[PDB]
Amino acid sequence: SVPGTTTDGMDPGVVATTSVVTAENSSASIATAGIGGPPQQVDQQETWRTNFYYNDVFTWSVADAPGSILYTVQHSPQNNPFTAVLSQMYAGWAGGMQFRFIVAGSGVFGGRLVAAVIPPGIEIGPGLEVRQFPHVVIDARSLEPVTITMPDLRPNMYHPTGDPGLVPTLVLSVYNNLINPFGGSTSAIQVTVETRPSEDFEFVMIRAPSSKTVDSISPAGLLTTPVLTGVGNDNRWNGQIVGLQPVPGGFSTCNRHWNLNGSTYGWSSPRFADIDHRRGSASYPGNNATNVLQFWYANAGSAIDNPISQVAPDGFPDMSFVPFNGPGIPAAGWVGFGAIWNSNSGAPNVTTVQAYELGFATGAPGNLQPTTNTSGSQTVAKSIYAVVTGTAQNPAGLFVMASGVISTPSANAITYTPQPDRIVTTPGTPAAAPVGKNTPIMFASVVRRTGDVNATAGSANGTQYGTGSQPLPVTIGLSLNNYSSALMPGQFFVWQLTFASGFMEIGLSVDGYFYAGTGASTTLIDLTELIDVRPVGPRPSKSTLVFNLG
Amino acid sequence: SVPGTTTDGMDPGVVATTSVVTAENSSASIATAGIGGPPQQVDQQETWRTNFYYNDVFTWSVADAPGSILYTVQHSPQNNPFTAVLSQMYAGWAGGMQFRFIVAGSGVFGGRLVAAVIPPGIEIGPGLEVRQFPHVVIDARSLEPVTITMPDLRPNMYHPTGDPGLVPTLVLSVYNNLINPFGGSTSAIQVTVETRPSEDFEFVMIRAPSSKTVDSISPAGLLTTPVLTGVGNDNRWNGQIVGLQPVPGGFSTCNRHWNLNGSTYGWSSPRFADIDHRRGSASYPGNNATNVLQFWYANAGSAIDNPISQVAPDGFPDMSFVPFNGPGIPAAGWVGFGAIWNSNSGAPNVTTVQAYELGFATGAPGNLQPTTNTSGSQTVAKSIYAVVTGTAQNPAGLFVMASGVISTPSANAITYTPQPDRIVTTPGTPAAAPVGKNTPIMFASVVRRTGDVNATAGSANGTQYGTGSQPLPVTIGLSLNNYSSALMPGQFFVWQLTFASGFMEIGLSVDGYFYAGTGASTTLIDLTELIDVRPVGPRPSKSTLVFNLG
Amino acid sequence: SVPGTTTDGMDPGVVATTSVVTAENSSASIATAGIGGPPQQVDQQETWRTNFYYNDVFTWSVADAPGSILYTVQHSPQNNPFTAVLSQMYAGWAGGMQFRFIVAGSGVFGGRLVAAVIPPGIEIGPG
Incomplete structure (x- = not known):
């Protein structure tokens, strides 16, 4: 006698059936997946076939209305942790996948x-009436686990590993509202999904693992655990990612930002190299050359320096120029150490090095003004400390270093300097807009300033944060490989970041932006207790990512 | 009727037996690998089990004496491309592995x-008499392939995936000298090894793939194909690796150099961050403060800035100071843009920024001299262009940027600037010494200079190369994971770099240095036609890595 | 008793299947392709589909290293001359194709x- 309180790992539970699961579907699936050859990895006594392994956990609270979708998984071999490894050596897959739900109520x-x-081709999100499909109702007082099989409802003969095609979706929405008859703060339960390949699951043809690898079939390995803790940098400042900064108003980033289509709209390679431009004009104001501020400018669209786009040279910051005159330190600007070289020789001049704020402006010879658009604007650089003498040569050149610091008028820290109101953007980039309760985020980093060199994290003067849209390993992996057949528009690729106290989720858009679901919250995430980063796969865009840091 | 000229992929050929392959060995191997549970992945009709997949190719010339070892493979599941993927989901393996040799003569x-x-525990290298073991002789005129089985001669019950233990080795040495009876330039043939798991091969217990991953069990994924082509940088200069520079005299690198034991002997993290030091003395020579050269110095062993070692602060170059006085540009020195901040406020001073050569010296107040040893020396910085005024404060601070350029007296390029005679090294580091025909290499990179800003690769003035011991992704992956039970001392981990014309091999020492076999050649490798990088596994140190670029 | 030096047009020689020529693959290919209606040009006595015909001749140098691709063809009716003639006559195809290699050495x-x-989903290039 086995009581229902304890469950075996090979125990399905109660095998609840649906009208989509038929014998005709299974017989057709084997008889038409036979074009791949004999079925592979179909030994029925293997431990990866017979045991249920962890897929997800999710929370069902009393504040969820009927019709509200709590869980959504796509049919994929990336659901199981073992058919995600076996798909590295096979060029196709076909068949079903059981899901076991354990409701801890x-x-x-x-x-x-x-x-x-849900059959393929149907939009998944709010407004999808799950209860008007062929469905199975599961009580919250259920003790034995309940399992349901996903049939392989496909229009293809088999699913190729890189581009699977159209797959069914599985949704767990609220049929009846959860009630706790007491009333109080203990109004939530949890359901755990495990997964196991069905008796008809198979891989069809073998292929070399040195072919299209794990970094080209799914973007699961772009965000690993050492990337977000202490190794990976951001794509704006080259500093350690020490937080997640929510942007409730939304932002847009053009430079060094790669989408899932493997293309950028900005003007920088995926690295932090020098800014180097030929034949941009330089001048100095007034006539006397004592304590003079060096000025440099060149029109956008004329920098033949990149093989990608020529609005600005490589490594140019996408920051608007805050104007400043005289001995006044500018506030919240990209400032990097630079110099001016003659074009006829290539020799950098002896005395005209300084901490030059680099940026974009609209009118160079008269009043300086900030700008966002690149069309009609000009790349403009100007030093922030006094330089004795200075070049006035019109075919002159500019050489600034890769990384930058923060221009601050005082030693006190300020907010994060790439605010969305001052980010240089080409015409044509998509915008990171909030989708429901989800909001765009930028990966913060401790970036030191010219008001305090020794300013690090936890300094008593205050920490200075610089934010970039993507991690540098993520945009490095996004520029080499293509994920067009990995995420349809209207979807995220969601990772589960677990902390020492709670856990939270971020998702990657098709356009390349990251999305944490925090609502209108703008509090910076600590990201110093991050222990685990694992991928959960494609999820709908209009679903609130779970976020509870405790 | 099947002629012997054409071979099937499932065809073993002639199954040549050895006295190490017995029935008692096989029966013992199954009966004692049963402690892992039932055998896994033992379905005999799988395509990965039945087909021979590529392992290696090697050249047998007429200049090879009898007793000279041409091929050496260790018994591992990383020989086969499919048991290397299946070992990501299992915590052990046991059993044999056939090897098929096709001699194209x-x-x-x-x-x-x-x-x-060879049984385990025997040293593999020159002086190993292969012909006095139980052996099989194979003619060069052989037409049908010949296969021989590796028995699993192990002292353990099973081999754990991370630490396998002692394994047999397989050697293909010259029994009789290859003769071409004509005489000429066509004196070489080729033998190809393929591999296939034996009937007794198995994996024993299952484990989650989110455990110890592919980046902790073997250093195969540290050197990937996009790393060595256009993405990965070096650990000294943060520039694109565009070549391999052989060092026939040998070198030693201390800073930012991680071994396979996951420990460094230098003073930098595996990134390119700023150099920032508190309470190091600064001064200026003479009395007048017009066009004065800024001097800064601080004793080694006193920089409380790192959690690793305190000889120098983070990001400090391991370059000896070449002395220079007056308006004379120094030659072959790490020079980066820097500044001096007061310790009492943290504010960097307005005018004292310049291109400061950063380095090590022995005597600061008198004559400056270069140094290699860190014990008794001092970190010393000095600007190379004139600065109006300058701080003389004794508790002052120094802030230099991460990347650097090359100090050149003229616009003409010179040789690679980190020469082995000027590399700062702590007492206790191992030296990269040549082992036979193999020589240490450093990964070159296009690093621009202060004589020519616009100097890139292929420039008509001449390219400037800066060399670092390891690639930055390699030393990033070496600092997080441990490969102590992956390479015994006296061995390399060899990758096969194939080009558009020929191919060559580099190997990774236990101490962390890279080794290409070019002899006394010092010609820089082009590395712009590199198309494939794949790992071949552990090989003996005293074996010449194959090198033919055409 | 042919000596092997002379080969017929209808002679395959020695047939070498790698691992992907399976019987149930052919059975799952034949029964599937009836979505185009009745099969056309299916008569295994016609001389256009019983004889081997020239496609493309290539060279093999001593300067070619191992791994260098000598002849690669995507699956098409254009690999046979008469199938390429009938390819403009018809609007779809389904089925395998035998390639016969004669080595002049x-x-x-x-x-x-x-x-x-190579399986169809695999990108073919340098790696």
């Missing part, structure tokens, strides 16, 4: 879930 | 090979 | 040639 709870297999 | 050739399975 | 030569069938 007591007998005093009430309310029900619902579980329907 | 005509009937007019002569000479023979020999093939013995 | 004497007994004094040495070296081998690998031949694999």
Whole structure:
């Protein structure tokens, strides 16, 4: 006698059936996946085939209305942790995948879930009536686990590993509202999904693992655990990613930002190299050359320095110029150590090095003004400390270093300097807009300033944060490989970041922006207790990513 | 009827037996690998089990004496490309592995090979008499392929995936000298090894792939194909690796150099961050403060800035100071843009920024001299262009940027600036010494100079090369994971770099240095036609890595 | 009793299947392709589909290293001349294709040639 309180790892539970799961579907699936050859990895006694391994956990609270979708998984071999490894050596897959749901509710709870297999081609999100499909209702007082099989409802003969095609989706929405009859702060339960390949799952043809690898079939390995803790940098400042800064108003980033289509709209390679431009004019104001401020400018669209785009040279910051005159330190600007070289020789001049704020402006000879658009604007550089003498040569050149610091009028720290109101953007880039409760984020980093060199994290003067849209390993991996057949528009690729106290989720858009679901919250995430980063796969865009740091 | 000229992929050929392969060994191997549970991935009709997949190719010339070892493979599941993928989801393996040799010689050739399975615990290298083991002799005129089985001669119950233990080795040495009876330039043939798991091969217990991953069990993924082409940088200059510079005299690198034991002997993190030091003395010579050269110095061993070692602050170059006085540009020195800040406020001073050569010296107040040893020396910085005024404060601070350029007296390029005679090294580091025909290499990179800003690769003035011991992704992956149970001392981890014309091999020492076999050649490798990088596994240190670029 | 020096047009020679020529693959290819209606030009007595016909001749130098691609063809009706003539006559195809390789080398030569069938989802290039 086995009581229902304890479950075996090979135990399915109660095998709840749906009308999408038929014998005709299974017989057709084998008889048409036979074009791949004999079925591979179909030994029925293997431990990866027979045991249920962890897929996800999710929270069902009493504040969830009926019809509200709590869980959504796509049919993929990346659901299981072992068919995601076996798909590295095979060029196709076909068949089903069971999902076991364990609802950890007591007998005093009430309310029900619902579980329907949505056929492919149907939009998944709010407004999808799960209860009007062929469905299975699951009580919150259920003790034995309930398993349901995903049939392989596909239009293809088999799913190729790189581009699978159209796949069914599985949704767990609220059938009946969860009730705790007491009332209080203990109004949430949890359901755990595990997964196991069905009796009809298979891989069809073998291929070399030195072919299209794990970094080209899915963007799961772009965000690893050492990347977000202490190794990976950001794509704006080349500093350690020490936080997540939510942007509730939304932003847009053009330079050094790669989408999932493997193309950028900005003017920089995926690295931090020098800014070097030929034949941009330089001048100095007034006539006397004592304590003079060096000025340099060149029109956008004329910098033949990149093989990608020629609005600005490589490594140019996408920061608007805050104007400043005289001995006044500018506030919140990209400032890097630079120099001016003659074009006829290539020799940098002896005395005209300084901490030059680099940026974009609209009118160079008269009043300086900030700008966002690149069309009609000009790349403009100007030193922030006094330089004795200075070049006035019109075909002159500018050489600034790769990384930068923060221009601050005082030693006191300020907010994060790439605010969305001052970010240089070409015409044509998409905007990171909030989708429901999800909001765009930028990866913060400790970037030191010219008001305090020794300013690090936890300094008593205050920490200075610089934010970039993507991590540098993520945009490095995004420029080499293509994920067009990995995420349709209207979807995220969601990772689960677990901390020492709670856990949270961020998702990657098709356009390349990261999305944490915090609502209108703007509090910076600590990211120093981050222990685990693992991928969970494609999820709908209009679904709130779970966020609880405690 | 099947002629012997064409071979099937499932065809073993002639199954040549050795006295190490017995029935008692196989029965013992299954009966004692049963402690892992039932055998896994033992379905005999799988395509990865039945087909021979590529392992290596090697050249047998007429200049090879009898007893000279041409091929050496260790018993591992990384030999096969499919048991290297299946070992990501299992925590052990046990059993044998067949090797098929196809000798592409005509009937007019002569000479023979020999093939013995060396038991574990025996040193592999020159002086190993293969022909006095139980062996199989293979003619060069052989047409049908010949296969021999590796028995799993192990002292353990099974081999754990991370630390396998002691394994047999397989050697293909020259039994009889290859003769071409004509005489000429066509004196070489080729033998190809393929590999296939034996009937007794198995994996024993399953484990989560989110455990110890592919980046902790073997250093195969540290050197990937995009790393060595256009993405990975070096650990000294943060520039694109565009070549391999052989060092026939040998060198030693201390800073930012990680071994396979996951420990460094230098003073930098695996990134390119700023140099920032508190309470190091600054001064200026003479009395007048017009066009004065700024001097800064601080004793080694006193920089409380790192959690690793305190000889120098983070990002400090391991370059000896070449002395220079007056308006004379120094030659071959690490020079980066820097400044001086007061310790009492943290504010960097307005005018004292310049291109400061950063380095090590022995005597600061009198004559400046270069140094290599860190014990008793001092970190010393000095600007190379004139600065109006300058700080003389004794608790002052120094802030230099991460990347650097090359100090050149003229616009003309010179040789690679980190020469082995000027590299700052702590007492206790190992030296990269040549082992036979193999010589240490440093990964070159296009690093621009202060004589020509616009100097890039292929410039008509001449290219400037800066060399670092390891690639930055390699030393980044070496600092997070441990490869102590992956390479015993006296061995390399060899990758096969194939070009558009030929191919060559580099190997990674236990101490962390890279080794290409070019002899006394010092010609820089082009590395712009590099198309493939794949790993071949552990090989003996005293074996010449194959090198032919055409 | 042909000596092997002379080969017929209808003679395959020695047939070498790698691992992907399976019987149930052919059965799952034949029954699937009825979505185009009745199959056309299916008569295994016609001389256009029983004889081997020239596609493309290539060279093999001693300067070619191992791994260098000598002849690669995507699956098409254009690999056969009569199938390429009927390809403009029809609007779809389904089925395999036998490739026969004749090596013009004497007994004094040495070296081998690998031949694999790549699955359709695999990008073919340098790596």
